[PDB]
Amino acid sequence: MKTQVAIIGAGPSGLLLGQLLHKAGIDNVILERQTPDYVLGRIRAGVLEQGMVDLLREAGVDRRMARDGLVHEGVEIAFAGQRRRIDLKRLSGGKTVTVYGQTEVTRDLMEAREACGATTVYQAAEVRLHDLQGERPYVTFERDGERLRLDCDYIAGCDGFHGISRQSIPAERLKVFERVYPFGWLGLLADTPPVSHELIYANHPRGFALCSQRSATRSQYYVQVPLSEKVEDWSDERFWTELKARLPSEVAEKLVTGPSLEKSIAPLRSFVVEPMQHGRLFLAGDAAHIVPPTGAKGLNLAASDVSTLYRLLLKAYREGRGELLERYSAICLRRIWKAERFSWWMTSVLHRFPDTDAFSQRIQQTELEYYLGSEAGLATIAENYVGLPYEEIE
Amino acid sequence: MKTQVAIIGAGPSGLLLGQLLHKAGIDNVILERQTPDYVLGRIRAGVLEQGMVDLLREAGVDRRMARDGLVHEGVEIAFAGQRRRIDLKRLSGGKTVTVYGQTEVTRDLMEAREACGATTVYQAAEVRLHDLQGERPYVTFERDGERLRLDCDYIAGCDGFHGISRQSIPAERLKVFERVYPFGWLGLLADTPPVSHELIYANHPRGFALCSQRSATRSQYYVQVPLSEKVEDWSDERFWTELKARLPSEVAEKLVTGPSLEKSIAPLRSFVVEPMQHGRLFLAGDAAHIVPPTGAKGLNLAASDVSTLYRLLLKAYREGRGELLERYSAICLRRIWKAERFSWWMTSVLHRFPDTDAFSQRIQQTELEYYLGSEAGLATIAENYVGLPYEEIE
Ligand SMILES: Cc1cc2nc3c(=O)[nH]c(=O)nc-3n(C[C@H](O)[C@H](O)[C@H](O)COP(=O)(O)OP(=O)(O)OC[C@H]3O[C@@H](n4cnc5c(N)ncnc54)[C@H](O)[C@@H]3O)c2cc1C
Ligand SMILES: Cc1cc2nc3c(=O)[nH]c(=O)nc-3n(C[C@H](O)[C@H](O)[C@H](O)COP(=O)(O)OP(=O)(O)OC[C@H]3O[C@@H](n4cnc5c(N)ncnc54)[C@H](O)[C@@H]3O)c2cc1C
Ligand SMILES: O=S([O-])[O-]
Numbered sequence: 190m191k192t193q194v195a196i197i198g199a200g201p202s203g204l205l206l207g208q209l210l211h212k213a214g215i216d217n218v219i220l221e222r223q224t225p226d227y228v229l230g231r232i233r234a235g236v237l238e239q240g241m242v243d244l245l246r247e248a249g250v251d252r253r254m255a256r257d258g259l260v261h262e263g264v265e266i267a268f269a270g271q272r273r274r275i276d277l278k279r280l281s282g283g284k285t286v287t288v289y290g291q292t293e294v295t296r297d298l299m300e301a302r303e304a305c306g307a308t309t310v311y312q313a314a315e316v317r318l319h320d321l322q323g324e325r326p327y328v329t330f331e332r333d334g335e336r337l338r339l340d341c342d343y344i345a346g347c348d349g350f351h352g353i354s355r356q357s358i359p360a361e362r363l364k365v366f367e368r369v370y371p372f373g374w375l376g377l378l379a380d381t382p383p384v385s386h387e388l389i390y391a392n393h394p395r396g397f398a399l400c401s402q403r404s405a406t407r408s409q410y411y412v413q414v415p416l417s418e419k420v421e422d423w424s425d426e427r428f429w430t431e432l433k434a435r436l437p438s439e440v441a442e443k444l445v446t447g448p449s450l451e452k453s454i455a456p457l458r459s460f461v462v463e464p465m466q467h468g469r470l471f472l473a474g475d476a477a478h479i480v481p482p483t484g485a486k487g488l489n490l491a492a493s494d495v496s497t498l499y500r501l502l503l504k505a506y507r508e509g510r511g512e513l514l515e516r517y518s519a520i521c522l523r524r525i526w527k528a529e530r531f532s533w534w535m536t537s538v539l540h541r542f543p544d545t546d547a548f549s550q551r552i553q554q555t556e557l558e559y560y561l562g563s564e565a566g567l568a569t570i571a572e573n574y575v576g577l578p579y580e581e582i583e
Numbered sequence: 584m585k586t587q588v589a590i591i592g593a594g595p596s597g598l599l600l601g602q603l604l605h606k607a608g609i610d611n612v613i614l615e616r617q618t619p620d621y622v623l624g625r626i627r628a629g630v631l632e633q634g635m636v637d638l639l640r641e642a643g644v645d646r647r648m649a650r651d652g653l654v655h656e657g658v659e660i661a662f663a664g665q666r667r668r669i670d671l672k673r674l675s676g677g678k679t680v681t682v683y684g685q686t687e688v689t690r691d692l693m694e695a696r697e698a699c700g701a702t703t704v705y706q707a708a709e710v711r712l713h714d715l716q717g718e719r720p721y722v723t724f725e726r727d728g729e730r731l732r733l734d735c736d737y738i739a740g741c742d743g744f745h746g747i748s749r750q751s752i753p754a755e756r757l758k759v760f761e762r763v764y765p766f767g768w769l770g771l772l773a774d775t776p777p778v779s780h781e782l783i784y785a786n787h788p789r790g791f792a793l794c795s796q797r798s799a800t801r802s803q804y805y806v807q808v809p810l811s812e813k814v815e816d817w818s819d820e821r822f823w824t825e826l827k828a829r830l831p832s833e834v835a836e837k838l839v840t841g842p843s844l845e846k847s848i849a850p851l852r853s854f855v856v857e858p859m860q861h862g863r864l865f866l867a868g869d870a871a872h873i874v875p876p877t878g879a880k881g882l883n884l885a886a887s888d889v890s891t892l893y894r895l896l897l898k899a900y901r902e903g904r905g906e907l908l909e910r911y912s913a914i915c916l917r918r919i920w921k922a923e924r925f926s927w928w929m930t931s932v933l934h935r936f937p938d939t940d941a942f943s944q945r946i947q948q949t950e951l952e953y954y955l956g957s958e959a960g961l962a963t964i965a966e967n968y969v970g971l972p973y974e975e976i977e
């Protein structure tokens with residue numbers, strides 16, 4: 190097989206890069222290890238930044254999002270029994286975020302790629318990368334009993350945290366930065382109406398809690414739990430009871446509870462690798478970094494990495510400026526680090542950390558009061574929450 | 584679930600450690616991601632060091648090996664049209680190597696573990712390690728639709744190069760050492776009798792070639808090929824013709840050719856991580872290192888890592904000397920590096936490297952002539968080939 194850009198992974202990153210490349214007239218092939226239904230089987234929510242929304246539109250995959258997506262002009266943080274609203278729209282001059290699940294976004298992308306007939310090979314096993322530092326790199330994989338080869342000009346590793354692309358880079362060239370948090374998120378998806386039309390991030394002595402929604406008909410709640418907790422030890426009633434206990438009475442009072450469609454505990458971790466490329470190989474999304482869920486920036490960083498790579502690829506193919514691709518990592522990393530910083534900040538002010546002393550507890554409460562009670566503080570949250578502007582190339 | 588030593592991976596490393604632990608009265612559980620047939624489906628040859636043979640016997644799994652194994656007292660290296668034999672037995676004082684495939688060894692171990700009823704969980708998905716730096720580490724995994732937890736005292740990561748154990752160690756604590764060779768090994772397994780009763784490593788201007796055997800009824804041959812070669816471009820007749828061209832006429836003359844039962848191209852690489860442990864987690868085998876095939880030391884290093892870990896575990900459980908486990912990496916690494924050194928040496932004197940000048944070519948030929956024509960040189964090869972003595976703990 191022969192293509193211009195080989196894409197490893199058919200998740201959000203890979204699908205979005207490929208559709209953008211498709212519309213731009215740049216040949217591309219996506220190799221996915223799992224099956225279409227397997228990828229679609231991963232149920233993930235989502236809070237899309239303006240930048241990602243624009244990118245999806247530019248990709249020609251926004252019809253369903255515009256119809257089913259939920260535009261939020263604000264977000265709330267609860268602490269000390271009070272609800273403090275951050276007017277994102279007003280504080281940013283008009284920017285908003287759109288609540289539309291990653292599952293739906295992935296589905297939309299798969300339908301668009303399937304419809305245009307772009308190349309995608311599902312169940313592509315034993316993917317291996319070759320000659321990355323040459324001008325003729327290629328990928329090998331095994332599908333339906335045979336060994337196939339894919340020659341290309343560039344390779345985009347969009348294969349997630351456990352993909353093969355990051356592992357195909359000599360460890361001596363990479364620098365890893367990571368952090369694991371002393372707690373996880375117990376989540377519960379329900380078909381009951383949300384307790385609020387905007388998300389509610391809550392800080393409470395017993396621990397963190399979040400009131401959100403996956404769609405107009407699906408509610409999603411979370412409560413902080415220690416790392417050793419067993420989802421099985423948490424019945425729906427125990428979850429509802431703990432959740433209400435971490436929210437202001439006015440909110441817990443009008444909350445509608447119901448049987449859980451799904452429940453699980455997710456860890457919170459940070460991971461960043463530098464650089465994010467090697468020769469003709471470029472990493473994007475989870476293959477290059479992980480952020481804690483607190484900022485809902487994971488899906489958004491995947492989008493921005495793809496935007497940068499896509500824009501740099503155009504420069505290479507349409508202006509013979511392939512040298513600019515060398516700046517891919519530095520550009521992405523500047524945004525990735527700010528996103529890691531903001532997620533870290535949100536996580537630190539909202540969660541209960543073990544063995545924390547009186548001073549730390551007081552400082553945390555003061556962080557919330559200062560930031561939510563100051564226009565400048567409110568602005569720092571707003572601009573970060575809606576997403577910082579994508580850095581223009583060069 | 585509760586056990587004393589949790590073992591990730593049911594390949595040679597894991598199975599051997601578990602059987603040794605089983606006989607010693609130390610509780611252990613093996614978690615394997617694939618199915619029994621899947622593991623057994625990997626057809627691998629083998630040249631066992633005296634040390635590994637003894638270990639298998641100590642494990643009580645040597646009956647079939649003693650019956651079907653092929654004891655070799657020597658090995659040959661061909662170059663400049665001549666066959667030079669290295670009398671391993673004589674040069675080492677009585678040590679030999681046993682030709683018995685990893686597939687057979689794995690089968691023997693699985694039958695022994697299955698018979699004694701030791702615990703093994705196949706198809707254990709999403710294996711995850713926890714609290715490694717505590718005194719109560721545990722493993723989580725999903726089997727047959729449910730989330731299970733395994734509490735233990737120690738965890739042995741025997742999950743291969745792409746396992747989860749090495750990835751469960753903070754990258755900031757590890758140092759990676761690696762090298763990739765500019766060529767691969769095109770192999771062909773046949774049911775024809777071997778051209779020789781002892782292996783023949785051959786150096787030839789056209790490239791490296793190896794005459795070996797997987798069993799008394801299966802022959803195994805290899806020829807060096809560039810990294811970009813396609814197994815499909817190599818018909819059996821082309822392989823046989825190239826093979827004979829790299830061997831002395833007397834050998835190529837009496838070689839029996841036949842249809843290939845299997846054919847593939849394998850890359851040659853080296854990989855070592857330091858340290859090989861973190862808290863209560865200890866890596867063994869491919870999860871910690873990779874050596875090129877040239878020395879046939881891969882399976883043997885797996886064996887020695889397991890021997891060291893097993894012996895250190897006994898010290899901990901029977902003498903309250905658990906502090907000695909801290910020396911696990913340093914002991915294994917000293918042997919791993921010498922094995923990497925010897926494999927590197929064998930690879931460098933037997934293969935044709937690209938863009939090599941006249942001086943390099945001459946030096947290589949001289950390396951072979953000096954080492955094969957000197958008793959001291961012959962001894963260095965012999966002691967390394969049969970395997971250096973396992974370092975006693977402390
Ligand atoms: C339970 C959970 C909930 C989350 N919820 C949110 C949320 O609400 N909001 C948010 O912003 N973030 C959230 N995240 C993170 C977010 O889902 C990721 O950032 C996003 O999936 C990254 O997309 P990606 O395409 O880069 O990687 P992935 O989605 O992981 O996709 C990578 C693809 O590559 C494939 N692949 C892997 N290895 C290979 C190989 N060797 N060869 C070929 N293909 C391969 C995979 O099968 C997969 O399809 C959540 C994560 C989890 C685990
Ligand atoms: C084609 C080929 C031929 C070779 N021929 C030889 C030879 O002739 N001689 C020689 O000495 N060496 C040879 N080697 C190398 C040798 O086979 C290895 O050194 C040996 O397999 C190492 O054994 P191990 O148990 O440590 O790892 P493995 O054999 O890889 O076993 C690891 C096990 O862990 C499982 N696992 C992986 N991830 C997970 C997870 N997340 N959870 C649970 N389980 C998991 C795997 O499924 C597997 O069963 C060859 C290698 C290849 C690829
Ligand atoms: O094969 S490479 O690293 O150009």
Ligand SMILES: O=S([O-])[O-]
Nearest residue numbers: 222223351616617
């Ligand atoms: O899909 S697996 O076994 O990485």
Ligand SMILES: O=S([O-])[O-]
Nearest residue numbers: 713714715716717
């Ligand atoms: O959980 S740890 O790293 O002890």
